Amino acid sequence: ADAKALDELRKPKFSSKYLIQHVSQKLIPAVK
């Protein structure tokens, strides 16, 4: 609802972090 949290509201929203996580998850086993 309203008044979510502060540590949930400190997140930088549309940063990448998960395209990086997707490439690091689909690359590292396949390069190993």
């Binding site: 008044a3 979510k4 502060l6 509201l9 930088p12 997707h22 690359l27």
Partner: protein, 290 residues
């Protein structure tokens, strides 16, 4: 679900979604859970690849939390911005940028013996205005010797090349003697400190000019973007932005099951929550639980 090497990078991280994952992980370890064995394998190529693709996961939430000093007068917010980039690089696992680009130089030309292939293999990591000013000096030493001047240190041709390259370096504006006497070390702590303070004065001016150049690039891009946007009538702007927003929504909406897709749509739900929460009471900001 942290994978025991991702969480080892987020222990000294200070942003939100990494520290929340660490807090959930540490509350899992408080409730009697074992920690996984840290893997002592995957020889140094995969090690530096995991470091490269894991420090990006600490840098990318960290860049979007660092406000640019756009349109500011003074070197104090530029130094705030460069210091926040330094703390971000130290949280992500990088060292001092001087040490890291020196390590990139020593990693690039470890097997090159002429100065010319040092200048041709460190080409990207130096500016073109400096690589040309070193290539003409190298060509002049090649005219003086008519033999490939070797990169040894005991070869005298390298010495008479470096005696011009130091003048090139000080004429560019950076004191090569202060840098060399810092990174070589000194005898006692007093004459080491006397050059450490001057190298840090140069280094402060160096990264401050770097961040100032980056901010002037963003300022010129923002002025060009606005002056190209203010030339359009409003209906063209609104249909272009609705088209861009809808197309970039559906680019994440077709792909389903991935983490970035659900994170993107959870972020759009959080943005719409922010608009609703600023709509409910607009003179007091958004509602935060306190």
């Amino acid at each position: 679900a942290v994978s025991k090497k991702e969480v080892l990078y987020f222990l000294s991280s200070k942003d939100a979604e990494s520290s929340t994952a660490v807090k959930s992980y540490l509350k899992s370890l408080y409730a009697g859970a074992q920690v996984e064995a840290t893997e002592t394998d995957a020889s140094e190529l995969i090690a530096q690849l995991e470091k490269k693709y894991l420090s990006a996961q600490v840098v990318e939430p960290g860049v979007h939390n660092i406000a640019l000093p756009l349109g500011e007068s003074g070197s104090a917010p530029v130094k705030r911005y460069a210091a926040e980039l330094f703390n971000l690089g130290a949280q992500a696992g990088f060292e001092c940028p001087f040490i890291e680009v020196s390590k990139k130089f020593g990693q690039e030309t470890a097997t090159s013996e002429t100065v010319k292939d040092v200048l041709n293999k460190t080409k990207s990591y130096v500016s073109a205005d400096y690589n040309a000013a070193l290539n003409e000096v190298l060509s002049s030493v090649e005219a003086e010797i008519n033999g490939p001047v070797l990169f040894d240190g005991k070869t005298e041709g390298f010495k008479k090349f470096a005696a011009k390259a130091k003048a090139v370096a000080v004429s560019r504006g950076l004191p090569a003697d202060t840098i060399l006497a810092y990174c070589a070390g000194s005898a006692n702590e007093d004459a080491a400190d006397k050059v450490s303070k001057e190298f840090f004065t140069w280094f402060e001016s160096a990264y401050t000019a770097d961040a100032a150049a980056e901010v002037k690039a963003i300022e010129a891009e923002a002025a060009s973007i606005l002056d190209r946007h203010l030339a359009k009538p409003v209906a063209q702007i609104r249909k272009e932005q609705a088209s861009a927003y809808a197309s970039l929504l559906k680019r994440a909406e077709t792909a389903k099951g991935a983490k970035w897709a659900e994170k993107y749509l959870e972020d759009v739900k959080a943005v719409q929550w922010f608009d609703a929460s600023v709509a409910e009471a607009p003179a007091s900001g958004p509602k935060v639980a306190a």
